[model samples]
Target: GAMKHREIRYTDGHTQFVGELHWDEQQGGKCPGVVVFPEAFGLNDHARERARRLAGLGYAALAADLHGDGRLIDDMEQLRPRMEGLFGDRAAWRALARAALDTLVAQPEVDADRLAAIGFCFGGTTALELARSGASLGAIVTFHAGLLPELPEDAGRIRGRVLVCHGAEDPLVQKEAIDAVMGEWRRDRVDWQFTFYGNAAHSFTDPAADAHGMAGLAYEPLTEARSWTAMRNLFDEVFS
Candidate 1:
């Protein structure tokens, strides 16, 4: 009676995919729905755990699918080809992202009026793409999200607050690009904040990041806790 979850399959006719839905069993009525975008490598255990975490917090969360058939690329090296399929075509990925969001909204346990999107690593960029597409999210939180949007002009389409959490020494992200993104928020007069955590690099939020043995990417305990709290604070401000 603590929580319940299920696998949800959806598509835009040509773009078929799957996503996992999670909700607290205590919440018998509809509650907020939060769409979760996973890392570049695709939906892993970490992503599903996040969905369950949100579910315990009274949200119907959907762990979105990037690669179909429940593919999990666990390592960066193994994800190259799959990465191209989405990164090479931003529009296509956005379509799939929307499809996931729609799936979450359609769930009976979800309250469509309250919605949010959060992502990790490459997933962060995916969340921003949804916001850029004029998706009505109360807030968008990205954990170590990448900088730069495919089209800067689309900033005008974003309709909610954004919190970008990043690691201070993350080599994957450039300082100049961070400034450019900050500038876009300023230029567009959008509500947003870019926060960098000290002693944390890319993939700070994921504990398994340390196993990857990749330079400039490691899991950080302190920053991960802090960033999660930051997102919670923002949610309190927005979802209320």
Candidate 2:
């Protein structure tokens, strides 16, 4: 059967979110569900591509909406306020993401117990935040994501295994930040794994990164391939 996708609407009371969901009609039964969080830029093509990729792999995937009504922001600077505000309002942010996750799980072809979440850039931070909120997920994976949590001790709330792939050359996140996250994860005894790619920069998995002209962002093929395989391996194991 062919792959299919549709729009899903969810909310956090006031802000309406419209997520793009994907699935393979060939799966023929309930399949693992994953939520793809986009960058701070909002739910753009990159995220929808990921969800589509996951659907091709026989999983149900949803690319969540960050800006209501699925609007995309062309300017990163102009988007900072909402991003920063979401970071500050932890409860509200988590609830919004939780609603998206719930929407994914509610799909007819999704296996609720085999749920996972993955994110890119700011969305990676969103994945961890969802886990930190104690949402029921089999696993959480991120690519060049923001590592540290708003609150260090909140790591204790994570109930799923974590896999993080970081680019060594990513300037946005420094050594101390990595060390701090390691410490917090250890302090909370979270099951976590980290992969580092030498010379890879921010948005290493996004082929269009260079086109964006961001100072530290570029696509690195090796990390993109390896990190995705790592995710596949972890999900296969965890979902067993």
Candidate 3:
């Protein structure tokens, strides 16, 4: 497996970034592609490593950049405001994400018809927004992502199967939000699955989460492994 970096220039006059693309070098034809959305910290090492891991499993994976100009946010003060901008105007966020998806599909190694997406934390919300925008994705997976998103008026427009892997004890996404999301999914009759890890909290997939000193965000290795297995099973089904 090899990883490549690509600059994705969008027609909206914004130059989005793609940090890493991992794919099998020996594959004779196009393979299923996955667009990875990074957490609030942006397209950092964790996201790139995840893309490489996915490539090891024989999928074309791109760690996409949502922030324009390949910006990476590390400081908490900067991260919050950067996230607020996209969260405040979700339509703009979706358009940026769609541009990343378009970049993924444009790759020669990608199978345009077999596309899926996964995101972490804020990135998870972006993935859901992309699905809500009616992108032709086969599936969408969210890990420790906020469940409540502003749903489109016509929920029937969603075209992908949704999988949510949440930490049961995450303070950021409470029961009320989860209930609301479930109600909306049921009302829309969309194919969806929700899994809650019993003892996990937010950012459970990131090994460096505890270093941030965030009270509710901690990494749980067991939860991470289980959630990844669940994602693999879903992808197996979607790409079959």
Supply every candidate's count of residue pairs whose N, Cα or C atoms clash at under 3 angstroms.
0, 0, 0
The number of the candidate with the highest TM-score is 2
The parts of candidate 1 lying over 4 Å away from their true place are 150-153
Per-residue lDDT tens digits for candidate 3, residues 115-156, read 999999999988988898889999999999976655657377
Candidate 1: deviation at residue 90, Å?
Answer: 1.6
Candidate 1 lDDT? 0.86
Worst 10 residues of 3 by lDDT: 3-12
Each prediction's TM-score against the native? Answer: 0.94, 0.96, 0.94
Model 3, runs deviating above 4 Å: 1-12
The sequence of per-residue lDDT tens digits that candidate 2 reaches over residues 1-240 is: 579999999887888999999999888789999999999899999899999999998899999998788888887686778888987888888887898899998889899989999999889989988998889998999999976644755757888999989998898776887898788789888999988889698999999999876778999998899999999999999875
Off-target runs (Cα >4 Å) in candidate 2 are 150-155
lDDT against the true structure, each candidate: 0.86, 0.88, 0.84
- Candidate 3's error at 174, in angstroms? 3.2
RMSD of 3: 1.7
A best-first ranking of the candidates according to their lDDT comes to 2, 1, 3
lDDT of 1 at 178: 88
TM-score of 2: 0.96
Error of 3 at 75 (Å): 1.5
